Amino acid sequence: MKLTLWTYEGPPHVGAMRVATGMTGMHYVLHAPQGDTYADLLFTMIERRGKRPPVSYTTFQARDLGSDTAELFQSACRDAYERFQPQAIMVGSSCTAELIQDDTGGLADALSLPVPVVHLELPSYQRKENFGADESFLQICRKLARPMERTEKVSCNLLGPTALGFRHRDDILEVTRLLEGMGIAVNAVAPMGASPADIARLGAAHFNVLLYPETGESAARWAEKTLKQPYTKTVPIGVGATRDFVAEVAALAGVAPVADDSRLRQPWWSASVDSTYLTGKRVFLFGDATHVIAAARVARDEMGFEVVGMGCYNREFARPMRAAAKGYGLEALVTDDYLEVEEAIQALAPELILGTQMERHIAKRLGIPCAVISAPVHVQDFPARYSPQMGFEGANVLFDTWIHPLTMGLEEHLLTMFR
Amino acid sequence: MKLTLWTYEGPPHVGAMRVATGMTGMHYVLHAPQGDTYADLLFTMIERRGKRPPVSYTTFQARDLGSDTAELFQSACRDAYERFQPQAIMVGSSCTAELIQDDTGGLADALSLPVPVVHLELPSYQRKENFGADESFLQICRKLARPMERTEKVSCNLLGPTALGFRHRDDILEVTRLLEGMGIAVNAVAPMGASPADIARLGAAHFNVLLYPETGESAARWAEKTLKQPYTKTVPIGVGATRDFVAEVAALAGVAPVADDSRLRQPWWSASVDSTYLTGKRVFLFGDATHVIAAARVARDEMGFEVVGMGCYNREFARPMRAAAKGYGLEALVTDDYLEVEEAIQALAPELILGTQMERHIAKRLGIPCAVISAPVHVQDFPARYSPQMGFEGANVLFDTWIHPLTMGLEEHLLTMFR
Amino acid sequence: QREVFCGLTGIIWLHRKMQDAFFLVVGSRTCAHLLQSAAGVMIFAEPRFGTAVLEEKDLAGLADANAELDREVDRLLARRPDIRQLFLVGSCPSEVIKLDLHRAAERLSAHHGPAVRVYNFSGSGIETTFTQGEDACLASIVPTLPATEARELLLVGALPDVVEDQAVSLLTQLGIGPVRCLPAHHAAEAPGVGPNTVFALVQPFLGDTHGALTRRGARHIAAPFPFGEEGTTLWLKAIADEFGVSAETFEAVTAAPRARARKAVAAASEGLRGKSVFFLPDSQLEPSLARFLTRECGMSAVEVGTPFLHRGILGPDLDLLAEGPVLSEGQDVERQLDRVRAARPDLTVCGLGLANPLEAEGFTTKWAIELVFTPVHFYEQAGDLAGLFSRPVRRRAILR
Amino acid sequence: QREVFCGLTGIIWLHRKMQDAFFLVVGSRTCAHLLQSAAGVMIFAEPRFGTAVLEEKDLAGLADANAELDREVDRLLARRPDIRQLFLVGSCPSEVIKLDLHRAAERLSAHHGPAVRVYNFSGSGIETTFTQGEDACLASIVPTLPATEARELLLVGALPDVVEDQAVSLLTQLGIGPVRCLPAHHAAEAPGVGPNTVFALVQPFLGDTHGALTRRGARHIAAPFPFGEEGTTLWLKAIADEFGVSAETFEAVTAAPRARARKAVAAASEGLRGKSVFFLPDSQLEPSLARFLTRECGMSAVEVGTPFLHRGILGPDLDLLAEGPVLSEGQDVERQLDRVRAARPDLTVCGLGLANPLEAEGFTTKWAIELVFTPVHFYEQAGDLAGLFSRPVRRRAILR
Ligand code: PMR
Ligand code: PMR
Ligand SMILES: [Cu+2]
């Protein structure tokens, strides 16, 4: 019953929303108390999405909690099909509805809707938002994706990108550009650019590209076993990681790499005599495991930073973060509590900090240069501009974003000194 | 005289230096005293040119004053040709050599260099950097560009982009993508990304595209006079300006107007609920004329800002700026003195300042949110990332860049009120 | 489907009013995520609200949950000894658990009662929604306020300190009746209520507070609510009639504020003359909103929707309101949004969840979540209230 | 072709040294752009260097330019009553115009005294390079200094205030008599120079300065320059011996800072061991820096480059510097870059213009402009000097 003020992730049903919202034609009803509507405006405002999130709450109250909950859910499913016309339906419960004795599966099955209906069992109190998104995408794949015939040209699937994700759109575009340069055509991008037809077509791709393991590792593994589809184990954030991704994806497809490195500017801009003051600057890193690992590699090898802190709020990804942090001579900070990270920053006193929005605010109170690199973000963090974190142009974005706090602080300190 | 501390434009030879640095195979031989090599530190550091600027300095001293000046110029030109093997050579004078008994013409043509030599007559004490950039490019075009049989398919020339220019590199890519989508292949981009062969091929293009009037207007008019190439009069900065440029270029080429608006997010993000506070914000605008006019259009029509001030440091573009300012119900501020711009800012008290680096610092002292939109910039401003000011992605960049100071100020003020 | 927030969102603007109150939400992770998301920037400034997450071990049993809640309250008191009124807020999972928050309040007001007076009120969406949380918080404090034997006028309703200061200043200029606003910024200066004291709402949604103060013996004075020049004018007119203030002195004291308020309202409403407004049920501010926009601002309301339309206390405001606009009780957000499609109103005052989709569809949108935050009451903020609706229409005109 | 800056570049740190001094550059727009670009962020702080652009009429008529300069300095004095010493700085177009800055400085010192004293020195590139600007400024100060009859030590050089404080404290606790600094912050604190007054040189480029103080009877102290550890020791040892301080007393003085200087140098020299360094002529600091790197940092030197060698002042460091490194004095970037390419040095000390281009070709580069700015002299900062030279090598090792 520990008092909680800030949560790095939401409840799993928020993750289920982040899958359904991304996919087109997949609406889901969700047993919730009247007032859980707050979660739709996350996509409405933070992501600035014109479309209403494809979600149909039951909105039960004290006058409907006794026995009318099942009737309300049945009416919600009926109306959802009748007017929203979804190509497929996915079904879950909120925490309050998890406590209330309801059965999401039985009602949806009894309605016998012709569109396919997937049933979600998410432990609300035990698990977290990323588990919700990963499990939702997994069940959608098992319901829709079936072993199919391969495409003529070599095809890949970008697995992992969901709604309300850090830079997922621009990373989709950048990885698609890299793959097009390779000669590989993207068969489907799921869940964000996908439809139930796309989940069906997932079997056609020659191999899977796991851009974000947090929301796509379960789907990648299930496609590895059932669909006989190999999946990429590296994440293309940073030039080194991008080249490793190009090499491994070229090996998987059998084509040659054709890395397009004309756009590349971060290596030269780091080698410039301007970036000499960057050498040995102490960086504390927090956020989801993939971004933290990639950012540590970028900061050490490509940026000349001394990584003094490594951490993740995904306890499900503690082992890879622990191994990576052991790589840099540190112990991973695997906690979902912002006070522990606060203490680590205070004791460590880094010169730069790259992490979540909470991390940026911690730096602001502590007066340290701060950049945002991970999933918990504000509305302002979602950019209208093309701001990838992946690929070679994403490397330039990373360099500029990480330099801006240090350059701003240096310029301010110099201006105060000269005054 | 006046006691100047900050000049918006440098000496005229800096513009010719920018033009020479943009091109490949063109070498600048400058009659300048030792110590005028500082201008090579702009290109190598601010622009991060991996190669030295293609500029050779005579570097005369008190000993080389009476008669050794001409011999030094001749030897410098000859040795520059032998060492660097340029496909063409431009010869000019610095401020000090104007009073010196210097004969660039005769000294250059006496050596009988096989490659064409371009003679530059720039009034150092009267004109400024943009005149140097315009006149050098114009004279290069007269020396190299000849009337020539047009390309089989429709071709365009991007006229204006030079070295040490504000986001010229990304605007070239954006406009090239726009033209390729429209079905128009860019014949040549000059001065930057060009060679004397490219300047010769300038005659092949069906029409000229003037991205930057400041450094390419004279070349465009001369091409209209002699090479019979119409030149675009709309600079594609902002969604409305981009659509006007697309329509006019499609009319010029005769191809159908096809523009890719899929990446465009500025109109939706402006129409969103989150941008209501932007309505009626008073914006002061300063910098070079083209960017200021385009930014005022962006502000008023797409961003909701009310333009409280307009201005430029370009006397050569005072008339278009005055016409535009009359358009927005204001009187333009055509001055090169940062004190007058500061006084206008103080009297106006704008909510947001869009201008040069000097305007950014003025806003910082006055506590006004600031963004950089014009040419005089630091090492900081030049992106490693793809940051165009033109096209639809450039409109996205404009929106995010202009909002970011307002978002920072609002967030800081909110967290100040809260605690 | 009701696209409305649960009463826990009332916490976010309540604790700005109560500097000595900590709102301990006993709920799942969902309600903590609600509080964090809706706070936005505020959660990075050590707020005074915290959610005690219930785990699967915490769900089973009641005595164990009560002991854990006591331990958490002690941990909070150790960190923040300053707090002297703790607000245990019930939530949806807490209500399904049936954790006796009233019994918990009884225990913790005996543990450290003299200093920390622990209150309890339901903020659960199954019971209360949006500003119903604020009126529930105020209905939890009234039954335990001390009795009084002096007739006093009290400003029931949470207002910004500036709006409160001008309200009390105007009531002082009236010359009769010293005021004691019901929300106490600290437990130190908590007010007194009894059959002697008479109360008048400032914000429409305080129906539970009506029940509490009516059982206390105080009597309600019906008045249109201070939203625009006419609203605050009739509010203070009802105050004067209740206190026997002569009409001439009231006219003298409100001649100038009425002048500035009318000027500001006209200036901001010039863009809204001959426009159409639609109200999606969010926060029960909407009947008074529609009245103010209809007569002062010149709008025409196709529908005024209210999640809970308390006729008895809103009565004067509907009386001022024209017969034209229709009144909607409850929400069927699909049907209501279809009605918005059909009407094509110039401006739609709707929730933040629907705010962006409505604009994407082609309808201008204003959101009343800002209205519960921004100072929009009485005379001076009349111009701000009008301009808050004016700005969306101006932006639509400017952008296209 | 030589890659140096005209002496106006020294102005920006001279004016940070001198709070009371304004640096009026009588030059064209090119020299104003030089000052602006070199200063960078500095110009936005409203610094104390300004350029009066010689307009076309000014180069046309010398008398009109002289009257305009008089009016300019009058307006500058009116704007800034704080300035008590003003430096009329010659420039290349000013020299070619041939307007007498000395006759001017005399005239305005006559008609603006005794408050404002105006000096003249030439920073023009035609007879000045990078640090000869500061050398010429200090040379201009010397003749106006009073003729003293009491023996004093005069430290000459733009020691940063913290470095000046360390040197002054070390001397005063060493046992010397009077210690004064030629770049006095205020004109009232200007030192006294006489036949009996001795002076010691902190930075090498002060050749014309040393010549200037030689004429007034001041006698030079033959010492290596206090850059790292031994360079500093030998400096303080020569000072002590000329002041007659016993050797054992001085050893007890300098033992404590010496150990920390050695430890700091050894901590940051680990990357520089067994490495080759190349010095392009930048600031006449390079023979001494090569001595420090070769003896203390374990760095081989392939060639040391200097704008012009002043063998008399720089003799001790050249003697300490090994016979192996060949000293080149001619500046010619065309052949000098080929020499760099042939040498293939691990570290290349060059100008900022050549830094990035040589970095692209595969050469690790350090820019000597950072030496004049950053405090690198004396013991406490010896480790800072070593780290300043070792950081590019570390960055290249990390970046592969
Ligand atoms: C339901 C929760 C929620 C979330 C996800 C945020 C973020 C968000 N809420 Mg804030 N907010 C939501 C809505 C509301 N917020 C709250 C407060 C508040 C208002 C008054 C305001 C706001 C806004 C925001 C913001 C934008 C922050 C910004 O302006 O920089 C989002 C994405 C912000 C805005 O401009 O909205 C149009 C603003 O003026 N919300 C409250 C009342 C307790 C709710 C329920
Ligand atoms: C005049 C030549 C020139 C120009 C164009 C600038 C800009 C510029 N000079 Mg600054 N500067 C150049 C070099 C030098 N500058 C001067 C000062 C100075 C230093 C000490 C420093 C610097 C630098 C810069 C900068 C980068 C600004 C930075 O990020 O600090 C440029 C582009 C900056 C740097 O090299 O970064 C490692 C840095 O630390 N310059 C001076 C001494 C008078 C010169 C001539
Ligand atoms: Cu910023």
Side-chain angles (χ1 to χ4, degrees), chain A residues 331-352:
Chain A
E331 307 308 299
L333 215 189
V334 181
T335 62
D336 70 90
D337 173 355
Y338 85 89
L339 284 327
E340 291 262 83
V341 160
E342 198 86 56
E343 186 33 59
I345 308 176
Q346 257 141 19
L348 251 67
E351 320 248 19
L352 174 71

Side-chain angles (χ1 to χ4, degrees), chain B residues 9-20:
Chain B
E9 319 194 40
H13 64 86
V14 169
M17 231 173 321
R18 292 170 40 166
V19 162

